[PDB]
Amino acid sequence: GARYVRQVRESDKSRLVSLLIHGPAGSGKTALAAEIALKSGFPFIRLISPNELSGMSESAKIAYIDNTFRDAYKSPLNILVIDSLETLVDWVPIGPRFSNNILQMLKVA
Amino acid sequence: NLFKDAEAEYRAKGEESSLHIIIFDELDSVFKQRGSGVGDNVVNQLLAKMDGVDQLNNILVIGMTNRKDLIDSALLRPGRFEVQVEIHLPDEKGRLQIFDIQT
Numbered sequence: 001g002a003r004y005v006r007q008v009r010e011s012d013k014s015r016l017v018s019l020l021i022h023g024p025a026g027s028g029k030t031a032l033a034a035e036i037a038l039k040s041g042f043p044f045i046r047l048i049s050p051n052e053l054s055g056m057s058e059s060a061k062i063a064y065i066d067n068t069f070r071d072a073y074k075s076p077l078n079i080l081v082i083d084s085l086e087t088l089v090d091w092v093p094i095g096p097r098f099s100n101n102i103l104q105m106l107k108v109a
Numbered sequence: 110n111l112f113k114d115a116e117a118e119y120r121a122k123g124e125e126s127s128l129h130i131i132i133f134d135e136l137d138s139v140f141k142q143r144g145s146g147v148g149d150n151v152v153n154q155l156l157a158k159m160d161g162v163d164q165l166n167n168i169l170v171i172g173m174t175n176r177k178d179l180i181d182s183a184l185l186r187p188g189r190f191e192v193q194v195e196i197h198l199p200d201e202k203g204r205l206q207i208f209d210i211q212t
């Protein structure tokens with residue numbers, strides 16, 4: 001993680017870096033992500049959890065994500081943490097049902 | 110129309126005016142985040158009056174609400190709604206004191 005942070009700060013062509021930490025449930029992922037973020041010093045850090053998109057409606061969620069991403073494009077350096085990605089896109093394995101608009105937006109973003 | 114009278118006095122007297130108060134209740138019912146409607150008209154009309162091209166420093170506006178994380182993000186910038194405070198439920202000493210004052 002430290003290596004990636006260092007590259008993202010001082011480079012010329014790498015202007016967008018993603019990652020994906022996956023593992024068995026209960027393995028303690030979100031803590032590790034936050035720890036990797038907290039030892040960077042970036043001016044702008046923000047987090048999106050299901051706890052804040054609680055009890056809203058779908059359109060509200062899309063609007064909220066839009067606003068967050070918009071705010072991410074007005075400062076030199078930034079970091080951004082996203083949790084679960086199968087809970088924002090409400091996933092129930094029988095049928096199987098889920099919501100498509102949110103997924104498509106996240107894939108484009 | 111809520112700012113007319115105070116404004117008149119500021120123009121007349123100057124810096125020797127008398128304080129005015131405006132109490133707002135349920136601030137979370139109309140002033141919601143502007144996205145990308147009537148709501149936007151309301152938000153803009155309030156924004157341009159709280160602090161606009163014309164200086165006005167003989168006023169004090171208090172606001173009361175039950176959900177503090179839904180007001181637009183531009184109404185909470187140093188200069189418009191500066192100090193934010195929380196009211197808890199009374200503790201035991203609070204109840205004793207309340208009893209003292211009421212009885």
Ligand SMILES: Nc1ncnc2c1ncn2[C@@H]1O[C@H](COP(=O)(O)OP(=O)(O)OP(=O)(O)O)[C@@H](O)[C@H]1O
Binds near residue numbers: 024028
């Ligand atoms: N490297 C670590 N060392 C010690 N404790 C850790 C470590 N990583 C996580 N934890 C502990 O894990 C707990 C929180 O778990 P956390 O929410 O990160 O799990 P999770 O993988 O996100 O869970 P879930 O899949 O159920 O959403 C805390 O008590 C934290 O101290």
